[model samples]
Target: DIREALANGEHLEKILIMAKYDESVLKKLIELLDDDLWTVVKNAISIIMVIAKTREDLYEPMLKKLFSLLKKSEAIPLTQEIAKAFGQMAKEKPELVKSMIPVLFANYRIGDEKTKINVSYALEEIAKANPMLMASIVRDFMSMLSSKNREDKLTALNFIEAMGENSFKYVNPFLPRIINLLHDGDEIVRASAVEALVHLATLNDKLRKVVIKRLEELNDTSSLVNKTVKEGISRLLLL
Candidate 1:
């Protein structure tokens, strides 16, 4: 009746409430993750989102299917939903999210701009759960930094920035690379590079001083770059 309810356009709120009442409905919905019709798949994820948020027991199996769906689909809308589900999962059980970071990075490397956006967003959600756990994945983003496209480098920086808070030791080895972005032709890139250091400077007194000194060497004209640095440095000084 669960898939039947979804196929017949039963109200989402109704189905989610049903899943909450019957564990059997939850299992049926998880199977819908691999269903042939994408709408049905997204609808399944919709119900699973509530289950993921409200209940605690099924995530190991749920995540296996959620990630399988992530790797299989190129649909941006569906990827966005998957990212949201991952965020909900991270909120309750980050260690489970951490166990899955490797696969996300693997997909990030091969994906395009839209795919990169969703996957990186998912990674950032995991970072919020545990920055130190995300630090281990820094090397995976390193190769992307060397790509000729500035967008790729920006995307990589965004992910690293999230991990910088507690994972600074692992991310610090890439310091030279981070500073190098300060002069990138794109002001947005320079801004994010500074954004990363803003966090990296925390829990690190000498690195804080290093950021202040290194930042002084640049004369970025973009208001965006200068503004982020100004605020970013103030945070750097807080400790």
Candidate 2:
């Protein structure tokens, strides 16, 4: 019936809102998350994202189902779509979305570059949704800084910077490692690392000193790195 409605080009917004009062409609949608067909699963997630804005109460169980489906998904295309859908839900229900962070992180760990990129976007949205709970995962995010892939390392650094002050304590222990990114051959990676460290340094006196000292050890090999670090160091000293 649901598949038929979708095939018939039914308006999901009206259909979902009409069924909002019915618990079974919500449950049925959640079940579709496990469907083997990627189209069905994507449609289900699209509907859930729409309904979730009005039915916040249902997000918890639905998110759990999404996390469960993530575990069983073998198709990368399906997983990428699911990851993006999870990101949409995360923006609406970050508290519930927090539960999926670890699952996304696990996927990021073993996934290919494209998978890891999607997972990064999902995790970043989760962080933006609620930094308090997201702070707990800073270490896991930081771990990606060491990934051999440039994108993975960049994603991890970008996510850390996005966390702002909440990431300090978690990022503290990894400061040495974070600083090493400045030496990366990719100028963009080094620039991202500098920008992230700049924000971290602003959190407190102790952190500022540590970041500044480590950053000073790095040579300005490229104009981009030099310029970024110059601005970053200037900002840190001014703060």
Candidate 3:
């Protein structure tokens, strides 16, 4: 069948690229999200993400359906793909996508490793799409910093890093907690905290002093943390 060819085509990415701007083709693809066949559903979602990059309006009409599919899907891999679709959709219609943040946040918490990573990426896109909402999401992410789950804490710090300068206010109140991350069991967590501190310090002089003062007091044994802290201080001094 023609659908089979499209699904398994050697040039499927090319075909999707050609179809990206075609509204009717896009609509047809949207309908395929509900297909009973897993391959069809998977390929359809993948193509839709490509289309969404430029022809987001073509996806606009099917927004609710797409989100519904994501919420209703039980398969972790499929759900991860669905989250990516929403992330692409968020790039343009962030206001509309804002409504899905809570659900995505919940899924991130309850989902598996891959699911958590995928949802974290989706949340980052959603946040960047609407900077105003960043202020509100900050509180929830702050709580994630101290979660018993290590991945949860890493995801929180990654989200803060993704928020960059916009995260300064939210990150300011947690400076001490973040500083302590230099001593965290996970090297990645410490590195992320250092990255965040460096970003925050660049925002203002007062914050720079706070971060540098902390770095000066940190008796870091890990060369990685020590180097990162020193680099942060070096960057701050230049500012």
Question: Each candidate: what lDDT?
Answer: 0.70, 0.67, 0.64
Best candidate according to TM-score: 1
- Candidate 1 lands at a TM-score of 0.52
> Which run of 10 residues does model 2 get worst, by summed lDDT?
107-116
Put the candidates in lDDT order, highest first: 1, 2, 3
Output the better candidate (1/3) by lDDT. Answer: 1
**Cα lDDT tens digits for candidate 2, 1-239:** 77656444467776577557777887787777776766677667777777777767767776666655555566665566666666566556655555456454444333344443444445555555556556656766777888889877876775665444434555678887888887788888989889878877876798888778777777777898888877777788776
The whole-model C-alpha lDDT of candidate 1 against the native structure comes to 0.70
Best by lDDT: 1
Top-down TM-score ranking? 1, 2, 3
Scored against the true structure, residue 7 in model 2 reaches a CA lDDT of 42
CA-RMSD of model 2? 9.2
Query: Model 1, 1-239: lDDT tens per residue?
Result: 66766765578888888878888877778878887766678788878777766567677777777766765667766777776777677777767775665444434443345544555556555556555555645666766677777767866775665453335566778888877877687888889788867756764788889988777666778998888888876777667
Could you tell which candidate, 1 or 2, scores higher by lDDT?
A: 1
Off by over 4 Å in 2: 1-19, 22-136
Q: Give candidate 3's TM-score.
A: 0.50
Candidate 3, which segments miss by more than 4 Å at Cα? 1-23, 27-132, 165-167, 180-187
Model 3, position 232, has a per-residue lDDT of 78
